[PDB]
Amino acid sequence: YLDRKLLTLEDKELGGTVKKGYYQMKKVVKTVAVKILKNEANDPALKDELLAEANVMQQLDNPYIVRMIGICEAESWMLVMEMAELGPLNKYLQQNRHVKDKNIIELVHQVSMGMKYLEESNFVHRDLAARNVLLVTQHYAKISDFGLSKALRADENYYKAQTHGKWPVKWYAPECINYYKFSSKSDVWSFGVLMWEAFSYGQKPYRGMKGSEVTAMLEKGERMGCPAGCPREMYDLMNLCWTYDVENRPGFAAVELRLRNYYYDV
Numbered sequence: 001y002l003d004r005k006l007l008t009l010e011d012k013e014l015g016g017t018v019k020k021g022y023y024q025m026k027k028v029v030k031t032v033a034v035k036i037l038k039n040e041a042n043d044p045a046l047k048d049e050l051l052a053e054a055n056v057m058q059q060l061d062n063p064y065i066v067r068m069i070g071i072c073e074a075e076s077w078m079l080v081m082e083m084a085e086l087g088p089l090n091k092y093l094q095q096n097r098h099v100k101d102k103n104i105i106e107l108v109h110q111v112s113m114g115m116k117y118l119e120e121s122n123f124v125h126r127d128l129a130a131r132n133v134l135l136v137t138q139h140y141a142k143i144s145d146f147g148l149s150k151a152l153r154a155d156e157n158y159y160k161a162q163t164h165g166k167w168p169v170k171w172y173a174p175e176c177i178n179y180y181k182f183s184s185k186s187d188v189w190s191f192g193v194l195m196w197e198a199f200s201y202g203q204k205p206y207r208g209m210k211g212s213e214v215t216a217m218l219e220k221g222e223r224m225g226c227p228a229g230c231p232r233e234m235y236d237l238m239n240l241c242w243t244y245d246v247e248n249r250p251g252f253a254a255v256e257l258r259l260r261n262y263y264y265d266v
């Protein structure tokens with residue numbers, strides 16, 4: 001738990017309510033991003049989600065995952081993260097349309113390294129989308145938003161949800177939609193959608209379609225087309241991520257290899 005007296009918040013709300021702040025550490029100040037909830041008139045489920053996020057993010061340690069500073073219980077309830085100051089990747093690419101192919105590949109490779117770590121750690125993210133990739137710099141991406149994430153049971157490779165909730169269905173794999181089963185391979189499917197977004201400079205996927213129409217499209221074997229100017233090898237990797245059968249879809253170790261820009265062995 002953090003000391004309210006060591007936190008300064010700027011008033012501007014970004015996009016729970018979000019503010020930038022400065023948190024005084026043992027020697028230096030750290031720039032932070034804070035999600036803020038009201039103490040009494042809050043939504044208990046939304047607070048439960050951020051407590052769940054905190055519980056997950058306390059167990060993670062990787063350079064491509066946003067680091068939590070802590071929780072502050074004061075005039076409001078606050079979840080404090082190290083700030084990735086350039087913000088969400090989708091918004092960044094919408095506003096910066098001359099980011100080069102090599103640079104987009106570098107960023108999505110960093111996401112694949114964070115996700116290879118998550119997969120090794122046996123956590124499922126369950127909301128992997130370009131809006132949840134935050135940029136530290138134009139050459140350094142981090143994964144964020146662990147509100148739906150789950151620690152997998154020791155005896156299974158998937159989390160089974162009771163039924164469909166309110167979900168980011170356009171990023172979800174068919175086994176998620178049809179059987180409510182979430183594995184790291186389901187996150188790989190989402191990563192393919194994230195790649196499409198990144199090479200479409202933050203356009204929304206399955207534009208104009210209802211979730212039910214996306215399900216029917218995918219079951220027929222149809223997929224989003226290649227973004228204008230997208231490197232062919234990156235569109236081919238998207239299609240591999242969008243393998244319908246979860247058993248033939250690659251895991252993140254295989255995907256991460258395919259985003260490296262140097263020679264390697266498997």
Ligand SMILES: Cc1ncoc1-c1cccc(Nc2nccc(N(CCCO)c3cccc4[nH]ncc34)n2)c1
Binds near residue numbers: 145
């Ligand atoms: C555009 C926008 N909308 C909401 O936040 C932003 C924004 C804008 C610029 C920078 C950042 N950076 C950032 N860096 C780390 C965490 C963080 N947030 C705010 C939500 C970002 O989608 C968080 C605070 C508390 C818990 C969190 N989990 N995942 C992110 C996050 N934001 C954001």
